[model samples]
Target chain A: MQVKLSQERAKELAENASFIASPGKGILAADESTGTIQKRFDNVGVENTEKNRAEYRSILFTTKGLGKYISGCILFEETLFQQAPNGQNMVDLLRAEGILPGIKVDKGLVTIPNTDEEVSTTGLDGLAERCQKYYNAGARFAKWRAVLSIDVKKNKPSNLSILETAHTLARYAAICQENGLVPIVEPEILADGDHSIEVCAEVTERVLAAVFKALNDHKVLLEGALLKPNMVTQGVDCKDKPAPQTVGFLTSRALRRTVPPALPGVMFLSGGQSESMATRHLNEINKCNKHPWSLSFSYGRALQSSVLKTWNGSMSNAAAAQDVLMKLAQQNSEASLGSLKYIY
Target chain B: KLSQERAKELAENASFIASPGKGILAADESTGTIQKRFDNVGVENTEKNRAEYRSILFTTKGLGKYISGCILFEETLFQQAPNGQNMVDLLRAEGILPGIKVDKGLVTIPNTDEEVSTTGLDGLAERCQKYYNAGARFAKWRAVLSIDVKKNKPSNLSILETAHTLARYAAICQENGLVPIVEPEILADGDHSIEVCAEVTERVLAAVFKALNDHKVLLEGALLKPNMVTQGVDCKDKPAPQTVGFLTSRALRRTVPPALPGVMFLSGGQSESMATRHLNEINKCNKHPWSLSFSYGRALQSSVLKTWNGSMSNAAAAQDVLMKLAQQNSEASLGSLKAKYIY
Candidate 1:
């Protein structure tokens, strides 16, 4: 009775809600680069020293009742290499605590040729070599990021930029599979300046089309690849963001049509949304989207903002920060489960 | 309904383009390019070289004895022979099928991140119609690919996309009633061996045919305008004529489906006799499924030019040389004429 995916590549796409939201269920979003972490340091009053960075991460990692809500934890490069309070490598500590460890592998973005300041992700120079190393280091999946700016102009992402990035992503995905790593194909940032929600929808559509076409062209096994994409919403300058229900309906509809039902899942980019707001929006999507692909969160800021602000990397503040991290994570889990009704 | 039907119509039409005792004439060189060739031998890059070449080929004593078609370049397609007859008419009188080269030649697509897409698709159908009006029955366009063994092998993105582009090209030409010559040029660059070239050609053509099926292109309406499988342009040890033939036929057998009609191999910078002998050996080897005729220019024309040296005086001599070369390939075709190949 299915009219979508054919025989060879229909992937099962349901997230383990019990696993995702069960105590200790948060995914560690270790996909950030050096410069990305520095930007967060600028916001906090820290010089980003190794100890300062370690002290900051330890507050969240060693939080009391941390396992109560977070399913898993992601690490930035420096954070992954650090030893925890008991002097265990972060991976050993996470494994002991029954959390999964993930790594971010994209090098970053570069300017696209003959476009109006458009750019493409450029880490592909030797990705297969890196993916193999990560796999040997106990990593099971790898993440690559490509960005799409949501300008309403007809030629904004220029077909060249869209295709170049999509083409590169397809090549990256194939190489990842050949190396035994499930790929998180993250095409991020639909938050262009002064664009409307309609413009946002348009950008997402074009980006998805190019990505799927390139995937088919490159013969990338869609079943093994996860799509990490921007949620459909108005750009920051739109003066209006769609309500949760509208966001849920539109994002699911767009993804359903273009994603081909063959891909394993869709884990949305965090994109600077507040934790509660991001949860409400995502929960609404899981509620409304009759999406063929499972929709989940690979969130960084939304999952960690409270802990960062709470601990301030001070040991004296650890218990309170840990409690906040656990409490916020639980709230988000219930929201994602569609079982939250404001547990005041 | 008719468009799809029309595609199959022309796919089979390739046989008519190579019907018995027939070969295609190489008058498809663009005017500027032809002018350079005329300039090379110090002949006037005037209206005369174009006319004289036509007259020479048209008058090649009994050339119609073996030529089925003559592909004219843009100017010559619209120009006349010296005897006040339209060039198409001159070939028509000799019973040769008149054809046109539809591509505007390859241009680099500015940003593919190490890839490219062919152009000249804008209003191609309209151009096909105009050529049909001008008495041409078929057309040719060349899309290029280069072989390099690295992480990004032909970049899957381009294989499907570019092949789909060509299928669309062939489809439009078919609706306009011209058999589309589908040429995917795999440049012989790098230091790869003949075996590598063979594998790359097979892979490129397989992807091309898959795209054709995806785009609903009628296989019957297309002719393969392929580069003969040859060693690298700068390879130290290029294959011999017999070796080239075996590798070439084996590669073609693996990729080109028997349901499609014919393959007209481009010379692609090979020596003239080497081109002929390779074609001969290809016909002399493996069970080729389609017409393995030579669709060459420089290789076909170079010897004739040396025989003629632009001598309007040596016209008979040049025509004799042209006739002999065409006869050699016309025989090569019989050898590659599969249902009866190898014996």
Candidate 2:
């Protein structure tokens, strides 16, 4: 059953979520840990150099018109300590535009027993202490990603991954609340699998459902936490790439049924969905039915691209990237509020 | 290792601890909880405070006649009588076994919107070991479940969380060689009918037993410290004791395993005699799957309190005071309390 949140509480969270994903606005997700960014860098064919990394992040943080659509920019531990070329702290620059800053607290995942088909996350050892550091360093919220793998094979989800991750989120949420930090729980199993879209939807739904159960069990204030779930869609290379309408309807219905009204909002991961495809899907999901939480995007590549290409590690490129960020942010922002038309 | 198997064996024994004609003397109120009692009589809350109150029970002159076990709060577990006899030593001499309360106490559940949480498990297994070494043979942890109109389902997550934790706690206590009291209390708060209370209790007990099975905990070493099912606090229509017996038995029969040793109830907000009478009626009715008895704090102590009344010369009076309640309840445990317990 959907969790019934009062209209007022829903609006407060919806406003916060919408503001974070507003036009010319997109998130400057600087919250990636050193190890994670290094991995993202590896995927993009770049060496993990400090100068190179700073330049890359500066390109992102300084993107043109980024403030228009993006209201928040999460930062890593190191980035929070670094200064931009303009002699300004990176976190300060994001706040200059009223953008909220967030940090990642998850250490990583560990193997769980009783289920050979899954793994549980482990990073709680010093979470309370780490959250304190992040909170003291200008972080208003924090993110923890628990990986839940779903496949269309025998024992596809041993249910281990989801349970472990959800429990981890609950445990994390407890600490975050104790320290007064908003928790953005990302149970992103990913969207690069080799299964049907329904398989993707089923696995995602099961994982999110379990996450809510765990959160409730651990007595989490659902209002204070944000859920980052993958929008139900087919694999990137599925034989049948779902029409925006089909993907939109299924995703919207799943969220309403499983996500209680207490959540602030649902921010879909771009995860292989093309820029326009993701945009169209988000727009259509809203059109299918009214939702309790504001449905929006916490995208990277979909909202990046032109900004990153134009900057390509140049100070002058900041204006161009920021502008592109703003244009896309406006489009998605309008789309999220159901006011944007998909004009080709 | 086979140690886990052994733990399961010991847990199984703990369940039958309070058989028919048996009840635990909740001697385990923390030095603090007991200090509250001492304070009620205007006595300072201290080891001496505990010694004075505990000695009444320990030296009751005829406690072994009724008390199956004395749950001495931690201080009493190690404190000695004025005559130099340790309290545990005293209880043993009087034919009463000694038990310890293991949970630190319920802490507030963060983000529960003001709900409470339970703690003291960080190093409980080790603590249980010490208590056992000090002649304590059993341990208990009480997790409170307060149900109201706002929180429904008690959330399978809460039930399972408390259950799995209880099982883990029970397993560890057994491993350390002590009987574990598995008490998951659903507080009687609203005036909701006894039927509603029974329904919720059934759900909770079912979940607890399921988790116990999942964790492979020995049911033998664990006794259920549950509340007597009745209407909520606001309900003006609280049912009679017969109804309480019916609802309680219904819930237990539906969820408690037939192999369980016994179900010892806590006296939740009932008058001391009222609690005993309810236990008596519950025993009088339904052929209980488990032996029905009590592990109460107040139901066994109020009359004793009335006897103590803060007077220095009142210690002997309180001893006689608690003895009568003990005898009354002991008869009640044996289904012989109809003589005066009738309302």
Candidate 3:
């Protein structure tokens, strides 16, 4: 009941994955669901309407020189079909700028029965058909996010949580590859616990090991896949916070230990880090050691926080908003190369 | 994929095999494994010798009263008894169902620190069908994991690989009309504490059950064969039966789903008396979701083999010895075994 991808199709996926992880370039995660986008709109007093949503994305898509730093843009299903104001489809707008369009294909998370508030991602049903449709509509890659938490006392990320998440991510990757889209395997460990950096590193390593084994079990083409993981860091509530250098070293070590060399890249999710903090961590990670895969960003809030504040839903500030987006992208681009100059 | 009719049959057979006050006879040891036991007792490892020995155990009058099923190796499953009756027919005459062992054995996982995964999935579904046609109503596949505290033994790779392999095997078995006895045996091969054993058991079971769910295995149609939680054999501090029983029950309660029909404990080289006492203690804890019983190989056979010693004249005595062990374990299953411990 299984099938393997053709070598030609695998090569296409690998090329797309490698391009998304190109050095000095990263991803712009604008794939917020409607409910998530509404929350972002709530912060700026903008109405949560489809028109405003399309307009906001149009601004980001039309930003001049975005291709210099952003190799890809992840879009929600709605934005994938929406049109720019000049009458071009959003996918075409991204293509016109040389950025690959990736779709966030996972439905979302649901609580696994018998677990301690742990969850596994869904949306596997009819995924192959959806991937084919997305690919036909100009998507070259796909993203699915699986989440885990850390709480040693409660034994959070129980063996069930880790296996469930890893298996689900692997299945999703297989389905995406079968239909001609590279899969970005994202297993995000939340930073909400009070555990130390050492504990975080252990859990991350374990989770990645389980994930890669599952990927192998499902016969996923690792060369055609990308990894979107949270950087290994101490919990947010921990009393002790290590420097970016320590975070970078441990993060790289964990990735090196568990992540296979066949994966094309490791695109980091911001995981609620502040804009400057996320960039600094990415810079340090790149400077720590040479990794087999490119260490870069596929950020959401870290890349969009300033841009969203500047836009405030007004066309009058479109140029300024686009400028802010470009500057942040350039900074992250420089950080991906470990060459960013920091003020602090 | 299993049909509704096949699913019902699987559930019914699984429940029957896990019937209360009875357990399985893990007589499914491979030919090489059984030969080692034969060599220990100075017996020739001939097909006739093997058939005669199994016939003695299977033909014990009313043996089915205590043993619900006998898991036979492929050779025994297809061979004829000394009287020319099919070995499966011998079990059936006494109301006992027959089962087959399906895994090939363990192989080292490459890049692992000598860790292993069970092989035999190359054509498992077809083999399940063949076994089912040979009168086997159930199948067993053992996936082994070892515990080592210092080396971080039973690495994440081993756990995931074995769990996934078991799930795949279970699915294939059900698809071809055989109830799968999902065995994830965590070997007691270290100096780790009982608490560490409990943790590893709980983690292993959690992973197994999760993999089963992901593979869509019908929990009602499956049984779990797990190792009891205890200090490693090398550990100097051996826990009492009560301690082992309590920890073992707590671990099963945490991870094993109620939909499963039973949890059959493997002896894993425990002495016969130790194995029986642990089973009795586990049943005493009571109120478990599934039946707690035994599917022991060495635990049930050690004394019987010693008493028989490869003599045709000793066959009747060997049958009695086999029946006595089965009866005692049946009593243990009901928490009523009263024999005093003897070394």
Candidate 4:
């Protein structure tokens, strides 16, 4: 049996999804897992304690004028419920800035049996209940990341891996919509192979094709969902690198070929690219022959690398860190319009 | 999770049906379909005619030597033979296990270009239990797919829907004590190349197996009934039996897990001689993890019907035709058939 969302709930979902993808504004992906946050904290010589994590996020959420460039901010569960040092709830701080609060709902990846070390995201047990709890906690959207890789010799993204990833993502999206949270359907193909840019494009196109099909099979409302995909580029180990314009063209073409026009937006995951590089790629992607959906960023490392360096876990450095974040956000905002003026 | 007893029974039964040099007799044509066969042979379509026709095939002496199982429609599963014994009893007396076809048929996927998915999952567990009580040890549910590379004919919606639906059917069948034969038949109705067919076959089978795993199916107890990867009938460049065998074997190897007991090919629109030759070549390629054999309908019965030509006196000759074809397929399953081309 299948469950249908009430008309009011459907309207709410589509409206929230559209608001998140508002023109010239993108998402702030501050939803790092505890382990991931620890790695970033370690790079800046800061302790990975809850208080420090709270402080760092408080700075991001409390940034003045953040709503001008960022429309939504994805929260880790801890930060979603955490209070600011001044005793205000973090959700209220985002609301004060007019930024919608979203949450990362996936538990993480688990190895798929009988594949060559491929993995699928696992958080589906009791996901509907979890989404409802998060919704009550002030999250209007959710993200679930399903990762894939490319190894031409070993068939790394095996058919099982692709199907498993797509099906899992679709189920997650349906459950989120049922609980009133817009789903950020993220199927991130990793840049871990020696394959060329063309190989990445082919794999990305196929993966997106399977994903949208599964979403439709599960009866997900395309109008209420957002695709958070990796931009098409060569693997990290490849010697034949393509220019940003080439990456932008291939990525846009792949999206045109697979993603449906009903989707509200295509917000890209930075996927280990540097801050300026990620910005340049987004600019080029937006500059390509116009797309049906808004092309923008839902970046994590690319948006936070400099902020973490400046904050260093101290309250005295918070204002400077917040300034650094807003600058980057504004750059990305302009990049989302293909109008960022960067020397590089 | 399936109980230990049910899992053991399913595995044992599936392996028994897929034993070396053994194949299935696909006599599960629906009444509507059988009417066409009867029309072609000028025989009246009636319960008595159908019973008499099936009785000849089931009572064939030595049939169990090559045919390990006979798939029956619901009517034949409970019908009485002309000799007053149950039709299923005739198969049991000859040592063949009785299996039933459980799928209701296909319905078009909305918004697709005529692509379809199989329906019958509603109350499937109840139906499966009833079938098992009536002496069915295995079940068959076929899902059809087609290729038109120009239009992307087998849309992804069709592939995912059918794959997931087949998995649900398999799970329900297992819960009710019947080994499931997972058949995803890619039709040979277009003008595509053999390579295109091979790609679609691999993609479709991959999705099917993944969904099976997702639905918690115990693969050790399952049998695969897939179409051999071959060029579309309207294609200008027809491939040899060897090419078909190699590509088909490769696709299965890359997608199907070794846990499966066997793969029985559905000879969709293939001539009897061509089907047998392809099966022989498939086995000749060898080194596969599962047994490769046939579960043919038209390819097995066309000649027999022509010989019968609607006469009760011709039953003996029709039985001979059936026996010869069964024996030939048995040899083909073992990679030992000497090809005798008739087309």
Candidate 5:
């Protein structure tokens, strides 16, 4: 059933999807599930609880001068409904700064049977209904993640896994649009092996080909959709690390080839990259300047790692933690526009 | 990368299964499916009953003269005959290579409630290795499609999904010692005609071979088990066997690569006589690059089950029925089953 998208509706969706990539604007991916946040809490020596979780998230959302850089913050469902200590609902707090509140819709990944090692994302069950509810609750966009692993020889992300994940993410995108939400389609290839940068680029291209083909089959309005892809880099365990400039060039060349122009923008996931490294690479990618869509970041650990260390459960340190977030946000904001000069 | 030597081995196995005047016998129904078959015959689905039924089919006198291969469920792969011979031993001694069905069955695609993707790729490499060690030389993985054009049940999403999965299964089979029989069976369940069947079958096979190319699966190492183009059971016009053969063979020639060694027909929902007649006509057409053959399930077994009717006394009669069906298909495969002249 192909729904007719009126010119007015298409324009509205195009504007909404592109706004996240507008000048000095990017996403703050704070959509870690409750259990996932516990791992971050463990690293900072703070107990994971609803009160502490809300407080920590409130510090990030309420950080001063955030609106100038962060155009959006993806929220875990729990934090979406919670109230901050300042007596304002978290959604309203984000809206107060003129940022869009997006929700992470995937439940998690499940192993595909009979394969050596592969997985597909879940939480597609009853998603259209959930999107309507989330829309009513102040979410204007949604994120669903699909992970792929690489070993072109061993076929870690087997062709089966690739097409399965692509079809899955495309269906989620279509459902999101039907219920008035911009879908941030993320197919993150886990950079977690001894693979080289060239191999990662190869896998990334294949994954993207499968993804967009499915999106086309599902009749998703590309103008109304956003891409959240991982930057091409050497695998995490590789002994040799290349220059950020090289990573930036390779990743940008890839996106230029695979992403369609109708997609409003591309926001990258900071998969296991250090905060400064993520920002520096984004700056270098922007410098490449050969791509059509706006390039930006949707960072989680890259932005939150420092803030969590600084706060460490102390209510009085909230101001200091908020400052850390602002600094990172400011740096990333400059990188979003190719203006960052990394200093020693 | 698949070594050229490994490719040669796979091609050799595939060629043997598609040898002139021969076709595969698809008895690899899942346990649940076999239970239903047993239920129709009013027999208990005990392991012994299942074993005895297979023993009758496998040990039928002179059966090896027609059957090139026998695909078995994982359970049947290890069962033993009362004569103290393992089923695998029985098949090999009779010159029939044993094959295993490796798919775990189907699950619904999220948005398309009726459309499905075949599961069971996880741990497949290890399973193939074990099956090779246990006397299996080739394998089968069935990926199903149903037609509902209005709602697009077998949409491009489902088509690409099934094709990629079958190619993945084929690659894993070659890496181990199994020659994979790629089964992408389009169900004949709609109110459509032979033209629609031919169109959908062509589209599906085109996608499957493209995916196989993308995955670098050696074309010579794979055999296609597809449905012959025919009108749906509910369709008002039931075409002649010759018409079904013409449509199906045309679809295969248009889409299947010449490098593929064989095209095997799955007798889906066809009566014994009609399925045999269809194969006979397909072989008569003789326009394809690949050899045309049959890999039948119920068409080969339904009469045997009826003859046996859950009784030990009727085993010989059941085996006779099984042998007659095998001989008919074997003759049909060679284009020698004389057709009844249309007056």
Candidate 6:
């Protein structure tokens, strides 16, 4: 049963999402929850102070030429309030670079009932009010991650898990549209099993099909939504992981079968891929792009891991860290259009 | 993918159950549930009493013409009639196909407090083989769901769980020569209107078919045993049987595939006459693609239960009650019976 939306509202949503999904552009996912940021800060020997967090983000957001490759920047809520070391709201820093400010709207995951271990993403309660506040704070889009697991023997991503995630994602997307934010519907199938690339492709297809069907059932305007899906690649423990081209081929094929052409973009989640590995796969994925949506990267760790390592909590290295960030952005922008080469 | 021959056999079995002017007898209540029913009649809940009650229904002289199949609990599968014939054999002698209830029972899914999933799949393949060996040609599995709008109780998770479980059961049943009857019984316990019930049922049915497709379950091989669309039990307004028929039929037409063979409406605690009239009206729905029939338990046996009163002398009267109800439903199955129509 599809609910009709006001044509004007739908058109605006579609237009905003299309802008964020423009060719040669992708999102910079810096919306790590406070706990996640704590761990990343610990690795860099930086205290998890609001000032330190702001400083790190200040470098990323204020980096020069980032807007050429990045269309949007997802910000943590705390970063929205803090000054950018220049007496201005950090949200302005992203806007200064022609980047749209997006928020991560999900609270977190809760264990699914009766299962040995499975989860459904939460944060739907009070979502409408929160989206309003986020919209007022200059956010134009949001992210919510629904995680799935794979175990061919045990049926890790049980039908219960898959269905729950897809339904939850759709409900979230609909709310985002009502509040004037394009939803980055992220259903991440974790890469922690021993399954082969073929298994990944199969599970991804089932999950994405379920997801799109749910979206259709809920009548969420696909033109106003972006998909943040994991690449169809083998599990970490597989004996022979696939090459970038194979990952690209299988991932795109699965998307072709399930994702509608109405969606404006398909952003690849880094999951557990290394920074270089992520860029390489995106590059190959673009080579196999036989579909309509913009194929690009919405990377977190793959874009920031090397930058953080180089900065290591030192103000003197801020420029060096910013350089690392710029390089990945520049390379990934090329990768978004299938122009990256290992030798290049 | 199901083999062509296997698919054909499944469709044939399903078609037989959906045969015009015929339905199914859902005598597959679990031991505990049947005991409660016997308790209401002051009958002892012993094996003999259970056997006697069932034997009376199986031995009803004219039942074969109306009932295409009889679903039995595990104990009933091995029980014997007073005449020394096995219950399965008794059913076969009367032209009624014997089917088994394969689902173990219901248990709550991990996080949903009120929502549940049916278990019983452990070693189910072997169990199906044994049931098939013992003269069973079809099986029924029940999945329970409750609707509550305030808490979103019939969440997408619950609907998907029911669909996935039913498809998995169907896939396994086909491998063992049992045509699976998927009963995703959304309880009529709330205060919702017919439109709300229609909405949830449509959503649930849509998800079920999607899941079946994903699992590669042959739709032609399965029967859908669904509750008729109606106002909730405690709702202030009651919809006419005609309205009920319209909503129920429209929901099925929208969500169910035309390739599926049948939709045997479960009475779901509807009054006997009300259930029959609803089925008759549903059959009258001109756009229906699948056979409209019944797989009733209480609605079929309520009059019989009152007549028997647990006495041997009343058995004749009970059998007479069975004959009357069977004839009424058979007539209704063809859309030929009107509300309050009597023989």
Q: Which structure among the candidates has the greatest lDDT? A: 4
**Each prediction's DockQ against the real complex:** 0.04, 0.10, 0.02, 0.03, 0.07, 0.02
Evaluated on CA atoms against the true complex, candidate 6 attains a DockQ of 0.02
Candidate 3 Cα errors over 4 Å, as ranges: A342-344, B1-343
Candidate 5, residues A4-98, lDDT tens digits: the string is 45676667667889887777889999999878898999998899989898889888888877988998899999988889987789999999898
Clashing residue pairs found in predicted model 6: A113-B110, A113-B111, A114-B110
Q: Residues B227-264, candidate 4, lDDT per residue (tens digit)?
A: 99898899999778898888888889889999999999
List clash counts for every candidate, in order. 19, 38, 0, 0, 8, 3
User: Model 2 captures what fraction of native contacts?
Assistant: 0.15
Candidate 3 shows a clash count of: 0
lDDT of 3 by residue, A126-243 (tens): 6777888999899999999999999999998888788778877886887788788899999999999799999998999999999998898767889999999999999999999899
State candidate 4's TM-score.
0.56
List, residue by residue over B1-343, the lDDT tens digit for candidate 5. 4677888998998999988878888888777888888998898888878888888888887878888899999989988976767988878877998999998777555345467677776567789999999999999998999887677667876897788788878887887879999999999998887778888998999999998876667879889999999887788997888888778777887889898888889988889999999999987886667889889888889999999998889999999898899999989988889563211
Interface-residue RMSD per candidate?
Answer: 16.5, 6.8, 11.5, 9.5, 7.7, 13.4
Residues B29-85, model 3: lDDT tens digits: 777888888998899989998998888888888899988888989999999988899
Per-candidate TM-score against the hidden true structure: 0.54, 0.62, 0.56, 0.56, 0.69, 0.55
- Residue B283's lDDT in candidate 6: 76
What residue runs in model 2 are displaced by over 4 Å at the alpha carbon?
A1-10, A22-94, A103-139, A144-182, A188-205, A212-225, A229-344, B1-4, B28-36, B55-180, B184-200, B203-221, B231-240, B305-324, B338-343
Per TM-score, the best of the predicted structures is 5
lDDT of 1 by residue, B197-239 (tens): 8888888899888866644556666778788888887779856
Residue range with the least summed lDDT across 10 consecutive positions in model 6 chain B: B106-115
Give me the displacement of residue A284 in model 3, in angstroms. 0.4
Model 4 CA deviation exceeding 4 Å by range: A342-344, B1-218, B221-343
Q: Residues A1-344, candidate 1, lDDT per residue (tens digit)?
A: 12122333223212322243332134547445567667776676656677766666766666555555555565665666678666767666666666655567666665542356666665543455676676566555667888766565656766655765776687667666655556678778567687766666667877898898877766566766777788888777778766778877777767876888767567777686788878887788778735565566678888777777777657788888778777776766665555556100
User: Can you tell me which runs of candidate 1 are displaced by over 4 Å?
Assistant: A1-248, A252-344, B1-12, B109-116, B150-153, B336-343
| TM-score for chain A, prediction 1 | 0.86
TM-score of chain A of each: 0.86, 0.85, 0.98, 0.97, 0.96, 0.96
